[PDB]
Ligand binder design. Structure first.
Ligand code: CA
Ligand code: CA
Ligand code: CA
Ligand code: CA
Ligand code: CA
Ligand code: CA
Lengths: 682, 741
């Protein structure tokens, strides 16, 4: 309990390149602790380190320290004796199969438990440079020792290298080598990829149906018509800087809009609601299956309430700040710095809210960081969907909020097409660059570390010369995948190829994550986690919000409801001039005229052009009406249809989700049978 | 395992009229088994053989029994049942009961007469089920269902109204009858722990739930009375109601006839008296109360969860779940494909009975249509017709309910549930679905379908001539139907629950079935049955559905339910203590499927209330007229004002009816009649078609539904998130118990 002596067996030997055992070779290496002490502060750190090392030795562990061949840095190898392993396996209730005994991953986990109970505080307080486990060997080369398997080499050769992209994930193998946390993360990623493949095939079918019915959408032909679409002069969008422009320049946008906006897309939106429900339920089943297989289950005011609401206000205070930043912007290098900016501020809030428990801190930081990223990523999409062009008024008296003038109307192509373009960008290009940066940054850091020259190097030095995966390693990966899932599900009513883009991205993502974790990053201590954690409630909330968001997208930001309404009610004799239902004349009977009579509350139109009547895209009465520029029966019918569609789709989808969740058992039948059999035989 | 010795110390004695102990009095009585064997076709011999076998097996299991001959019926024989202390302890080890210990709570055996009589009866019943008699034959339930044993039951302390003769015997039944279960104790606190100890955890949790329901109904009723008084005080400033009452304005409103024949154009004056009380019924006070009830439902559910967790800690409702024994009917007949086919057929039959009650509702509609004319020929006639229709629908539903109870028993018997709990759940879902449809179909039809599809006076909707509603809205009719159904069901159900057991006991006494012992006294009583408090839970859940689903009609429904529950606790406790035979205590950590049912009803209630306010209420039309149709672009008034509402909303109709008959000309001599819809007035370029006002009102209704649903669901989510389902004090007590043990 005091600094009686130092670490025994203090000898230096680095001749064996891959000696995961001690100098004697009898016992392997469970951990390595890196420090530097040969050169007030120095002597105090020496005293504290010697005291802690004496405590560790007195507790029963076997440690010995060797200085680096390449001086002032010393590594201590750590191995737990058989008796210590047995007693702490009895303490920590590990499920060994009773019919080299302990797998190296769980050996390292137990040793880390010992270090925590008697480590991170010293590491944080400049005492120990590092503390880590060791890999089998170099990933691309076999282990020199034959007794010790090169499980890492096999994992890299058949699962981590890109040449093994198509091969199935050795999930049991990666669980064994890395730990239950990484295992369940990759299992969830693979199951997500499978369900993405299913939904992407269905969405491709719907997209191709719309593609086949390309020249059968009459409004696009009317758009591309040099007469019907050429004699339509849409009013200028901005004051004195935008010109009166004809709809002819929107024919390509019209074709893409026929592809992206059709009853096929509506069917895919409904199917995507159903598929989200199925995804959640079958992930529950698969997670229960993994709980059975991997034995994931293990065990080990008023003043505060004012403080609770104190930070929540600050959290809400910062959220609206980053809202305006994106809106004013409407940028990758700023985004990455934004995250550590988010990290720093979320740390501060957690600091004032810390119950000092690691899991509680994780939950709080998860919620805060997810809110920050959610806003920073989906603010532009939400604006384009719901707030862009909806509050504009009309050419007479356009809505001026303040000295800031002329809240923008929609683009010539359409708000839905712009949203689809933004989704495609953030989905493909920025995700690809995220993967490229994610795979290059650790490799570049390792390259510069080697270039600093900091010949055969032993295993501890080899692993030390690597980037240490810091706190909350898999958290960023989960955040990335959850953002991708939010893009897939929240906005799937825009274009149906989002699951296909996510499918390609995930096929690359599994390989890039595995490759970087295997090669570029120092190995972490294996842990256990029966579920993905707070990400499960986050996904459930995203799923619930997805129904509302998709229904609102279809009703408000998509013109499908106005087109359906025109077909079913404004082609009949009382409103239309056709004997039966049709869609011709849709543009001429939906676009609203406007004579040039502007309030003097400037008149940019006279300076912009020499015309008299321009046709803007809203549903008001035409000029000359007894209540001109006012809303009309057609506008109120369209708004009624939008609201009714929202209500009907919301209620039907929610009831279907309830029925599916009720009629699909949470736990698989085979899982029940195997659990019952093992309980019977055990 | 064979019949060798039976009926130990067989002696006849009844001189001690109030004694729950044996003839010697050393050991008490945990149970009584009733049979009769002395008096065909060899079946009596077979039953004697089997019963002797079972008795010998029971005695070999170590129980102690004492059989007496009935003092009245020679054939009737009672057998008193007690378990020795060693057997009690070993079976407590078998099923790990939690007992006090030095007052901490611990497992099968503690360090601390000790066995409460309820626990003794529960343990003895467990033994009786486990022990075999004999192919393999299971236990007591098979014999009882087979008619071998006539009965098997526990015993009360004494007569409810009289103290026990034995001074050493505590009269907990007498105490529960004095300070509870009696009208003079209607307004006093419930000895919940005492009634739990006497009757069981299931009975205790039911009564706790009922008391807590009354507690929350008190708050809901207070807020409802506040809003109702707001509406009643604002009665004099109801501009639309006053404008209707005005003979100068309302007297010029000649509404078109409702029925095709023999109904005159009627003025709106006769609707003034209904409108005065209608203004209280659909006003911003009722809207605020509807929102408050949307919040209060979530508060009720969350606080009941907290109270239930507290009771789980205190009463140790979590007991080890031994494997449930099969039902005798299921085991009598023992592929799975045929059983699934039978289940599908049973579901088809249930849907058939649901269709039958739907047809009954349609018949009620036809009766309303056929009786409105005669009411008009002979207190407005439509109000009288609505009241009579409510009365007749209530009577018909009550009559059909008992028949459905019987047929649901038969259906669940025909289908095969493997265990008693599965039988309970299947019967729960089936019975609740039928009760839901039967009790809420009329209210749903009146709220959402009555008058919503009528068309205009030209070309009305025929099926024929679906019901049309009143200009003030059908909220008054919904309120009348709701109050009538609710109060009538309460009164009729309490009258049944009191008289039926009491009447059965009285006729049993009249058939001569004077000093009598405890076992005979309790035998001459009505058995509870294997179901138990299922029906009371069902009744209270139906009342909760009435309170929450239709709370947007009138705010005093919680007050009516409050009075009803105050009476309900007393009637149920009184009947259970006096009228009915004591029921074997059980364990139940929750109310069961009724809590998922309540959660589903709560989720449905937001939609139902929002749709009620938007469609069946006129509040949204009044608000829209005020805020958008007094203004110059639509109206004439310079500022926002409600006046002109009636003259501006009701749509005119010139007499041009299609010949697809024209009864209006035969039934009257008038030219322009005003009906309650927003279609275009005649002479409009698109006349008798929907108008911009109509679509504006529809848009307002839909937007209000969307906003209310989303906001209220968000509030409920935030409240459920902010309110922990486990009490802080309960968690602290759990931590203290864990630390001590
Ligand atoms: Ca990525
Ligand atoms: Ca990644
Ligand atoms: Ca399920
Ligand atoms: Ca009642
Ligand atoms: Ca009752
Ligand atoms: Ca809650």
């Amino acid at each position: 309990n005091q600094q009686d002596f130092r670490t025994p067996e203090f000898e230096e030997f680095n001749g064996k390149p891959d000696s995961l055992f001690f100098t004697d070779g009898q016992r392997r290496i469970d951990f390595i602790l890196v420090y530097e002490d040969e050169s007030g502060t120095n002597e105090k750190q020496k005293r504290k380190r010697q005291a802690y090392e004496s405590n560790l030795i007195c507790h029963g562990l076997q440690l010995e320290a060797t200085r680096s061949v390449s001086d002032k840095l010393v590594f201590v190898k750590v191995h737990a004796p058989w008796e210590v392993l047995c007693t702490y396996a009895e303490i920590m209730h590990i499920k060994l199969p009773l019919k080299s005994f302990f797998n190296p991953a769980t050996r390292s986990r137990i040793v880390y438990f010992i270090l925590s109970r008697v480590i991170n505080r010293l590491v944080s307080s400049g005492i120990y440079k590092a503390a880590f486990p060791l890999h089998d060997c170099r990933f691309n080369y076999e282990s020199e020792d034959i007794s010790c398997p090169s499980e890492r080499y096999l994992l890299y050769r058949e699962w981590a290298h890109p040449r093994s992209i198509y091969k199935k994930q050795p999930l049991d193998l990666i669980r064994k080598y890395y730990g239950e946390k990484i295992g369940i993360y990759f299992a969830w990623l693979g199951y997500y990829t499978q369900m993405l493949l299913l939904a992407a095939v269905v969405g491709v079918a719907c997209f191709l149906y719309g593609y086949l019915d390309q020249d059968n959408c009459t409004w696009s032909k009317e758009v591309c018509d040099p007469d019907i679409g050429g004699q339509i002069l849409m009013c200028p969008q901005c004051d004195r800087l935008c010109p009166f422009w004809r709809l002819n320049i929107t024919c390509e946008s019209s074709k893409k809009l026929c592809i992206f906006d059709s009853f096929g897309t509506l069917i895919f939106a409904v199917f995507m609601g159903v598929w989200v429900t199925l995804f959640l339920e079958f992930w529950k089943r698969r997670q229960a299956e993994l709980e059975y297989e991997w034995d994931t289950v293990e065990l080990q005011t008023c003043g505060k309430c004012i403080r609770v609401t104190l930070c929540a206000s600050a959290v809400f205070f910062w959220i609206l700040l980053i809202i305006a930043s994106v809106i004013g912007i409407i940028s990758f290098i700023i985004i990455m710095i934004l995250n550590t900016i988010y990290e720093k501020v979320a740390i501060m809030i957690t600091n004032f809210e810390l119950p000092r428990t690691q899991t509680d801190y994780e939950n709080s930081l998860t919620m805060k960081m997810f809110l920050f990223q959610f806003v920073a990523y989906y603010s532009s999409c939400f604006y384009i969907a719901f707030f862009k062009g909806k509050f504009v008024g009309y050419p007479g008296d356009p809505v001026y909020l303040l000295g800031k003038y002329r809240s923008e109307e929609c683009d010539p192509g359409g708000c839905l097409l712009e949203l689809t373009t933004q989704l495609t960008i953030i989905m493909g290009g920025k995700a690809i660059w995220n993967n490229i940066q994610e795979v290059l940054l650790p490799w570049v850091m390792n390259l510069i570390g080697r270039y600093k020259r900091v010949k055969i190097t032993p295993r501890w030095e080899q692993d030390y010369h690597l980037q240490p995966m810091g706190k909350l390693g898999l958290f960023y990966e989960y955040l990335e995948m959850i953002i991708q899932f939010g893009f897939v599900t929240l906005f799937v009513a825009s274009f149906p190829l989002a699951p296909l883009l996510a499918l390609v991205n995930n096929i690359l993502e599994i390989r890039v994550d595995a490759w970087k974790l295997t090669t570029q990053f120092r190995r972490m201590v294996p842990e256990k986690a029966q579920d993905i954690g707070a990400w499960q409630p986050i996904m459930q909330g995203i799923a619930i919000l997805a129904v509302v968001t998709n229904a609102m997208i279809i009703a408000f930001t998509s013109d499908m409801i106005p087109r359906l309404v025109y077909y079913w009610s404004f082609s009949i004799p009382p409103y239309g001039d056709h004997t039966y239902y049709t869609m011709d004349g849709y543009i001429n009977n939906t676009l609203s005229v406007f004579n040039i009579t502007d309030f003097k509350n400037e008149n940019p139109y006279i300076g912009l052009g020499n015309y008299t009547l321009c046709r803007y895209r809203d549903f008001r009465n035409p000029p000359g009406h007894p209540q001109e520029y006012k809303h009309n029966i057609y506008y109120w019918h369209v708004i009624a249809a939008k609201l009714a569609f929202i209500i009907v789709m919301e209620h039907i989808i929610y009831s279907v989700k309830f029925f599916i969740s009720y009629a699909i058992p949470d736990v698989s039948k085979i899982t029940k049978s195997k659990i019952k059999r093992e309980k019977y035989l055990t």
